[PDB]
Write a protein that binds this ligand. Structure first.
Ligand SMILES: Cc1c2c(c(O)c3c(O)cccc13)C(=O)[C@]1(O)C(=O)C(C(N)=O)=C(O)[C@@H](N(C)C)[C@@H]1C2
Ligand SMILES: Cc1c2c(c(O)c3c(O)cccc13)C(=O)[C@]1(O)C(=O)C(C(N)=O)=C(O)[C@@H](N(C)C)[C@@H]1C2
Ligand SMILES: [Cl-]
Ligand SMILES: [Cl-]
Ligand SMILES: [Cl-]
Ligand SMILES: [Cl-]
Ligand SMILES: [Cl-]
Ligand SMILES: [Cl-]
Ligand SMILES: [Cl-]
Ligand SMILES: [Cl-]
Ligand SMILES: [K+]
Ligand SMILES: [K+]
Ligand SMILES: [K+]
Ligand SMILES: [K+]
Lengths: 195, 195
């Protein structure tokens, strides 16, 4: 079938849902695309290349809150950014695993640079803005991965497991996110005060 | 060689460092153990079983801050618990991936029940204590996974990438951890006040 970049990424994302990341293979991708393996090789060299592209494309297609709105607080940007990020990672099977360990792509530079600059414009040093952003990413990644991978007792554990059996992960994520954000705020506002 | 539980888990952990999680196979484990595959099968049924056991054993061997010290604050317990957890996950290649999506084992019940009970004894509802604990786990998991998987530019991104190129992940983890903990504290102390 058609083998332009968009079509290959389309088939690859469809395949990723069928197989998950560890099961996804260029052999299976070729079969999906109605092509022989050496044809596919011309377009996509190996699994790693493909995964790196899927990481970019999942966000490009689905992660829509990548920039603060006009006049938006840094707290509110991080919140919305995290929710958007989480929902994009959840859209494909093992999407958080696809994303892990990737560095911003060239096509993401202006976005990520704006995010970093925005934090500095709200009083964070670059370093502290980065650490806030990284913590949001890491928390959201851990929560998504745990959600996507979870797919006699003592009484509090029994209860806790009932609690987790009770939603998709959203409620715990949102509560934890608020805690994170408020902690950043306590840190920012402290300036050089002991806190 | 010897095929008791401890010896099999020993060889499996050694193998996990050589291969990583996706590359780890029962075929390769048998070879390591000097045995044929059907011998191994008697002891270890499949990769999943093995991984579930490695998740328990990595913590049992290396995660030493599993309980609060006498008189220890809940903030200080979470801090120490997170640092211990992080260091245990980092000890083996793909250790955080091994841990993902596991539920406490029977051999972990008393530990996890104590942790949950401790949070309730410091004023958290079970639910809110659980959410605090889960957020710590998820943040630490995301940070470890990103660290373990990371193994023209606009100027702030260039700087940020220099910043991350600069340590193992520890500094950003520790800074984010403080933020998390302080946010939980702000939430706990608020009681029913709008905050
Ligand atoms: C600033 C930054 C970010 C990311 C990132 O990997 C990263 C890095 O690896 C080194 C230095 C800086 C960054 C993100 O992955 C990313 O997910 C992302 O690319 C991103 C994006 N492209 O919109 C985000 O929304 C951000 N977020 C979830 C907080 C975060 C931003
Ligand atoms: C309370 C709890 C925990 C864990 C967990 O998976 C879990 C769950 O899956 C459902 C309900 C409750 C829990 C942990 O994995 C674990 O890593 C863990 O087993 C654990 C341990 N065994 O010592 C921890 O130290 C805890 N931590 C890193 C905050 C955390 C505790
Ligand atoms: Cl074509
Ligand atoms: Cl195209
Ligand atoms: Cl706002
Ligand atoms: Cl502020
Ligand atoms: Cl034996
Ligand atoms: Cl044994
Ligand atoms: Cl203390
Ligand atoms: Cl307190
Ligand atoms: K990334
Ligand atoms: K700067
Ligand atoms: K677990
Ligand atoms: K209870």
């Amino acid at each position: 079938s058609r083998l332009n970049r968009e079509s290959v990424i389309d088939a690859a994302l469809e395949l990723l849902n069928e197989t998950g990341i560890d099961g996804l293979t260029t052999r299976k991708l070729a079969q999906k695309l109605g092509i022989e393996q050496p044809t596919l090789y011309w377009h996509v060299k190996n699994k790693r290349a493909l995964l790196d592209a899927l990481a970019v494309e999942i966000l490009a297609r689905h992660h829509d809150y990548s920039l603060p709105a006009a006049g938006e607080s840094w707290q509110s940007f991080l919140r919305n950014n995290a929710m958007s990020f989480r929902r994009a990672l959840l859209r494909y099977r093992d999407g958080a695993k696809v994303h892990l360990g990737t560095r911003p792509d060239e096509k993401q530079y202006d976005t990520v640079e704006t995010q970093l600059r925005f934090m500095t414009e709200n009083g964070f040093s670059l370093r502290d803005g980065l650490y806030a952003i990284s913590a949001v990413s890491h928390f959201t990644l851990g929560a998504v991965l745990e959600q996507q991978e979870h797919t006699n007792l003592p009484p509090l554990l029994r209860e806790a497991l009932q609690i987790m059996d009770s939603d998709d992960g959203e409620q715990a994520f949102l509560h934890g996110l608020e805690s994170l954000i408020r902690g950043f705020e306590v840190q920012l506002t402290a300036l050089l005060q002991i806190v």
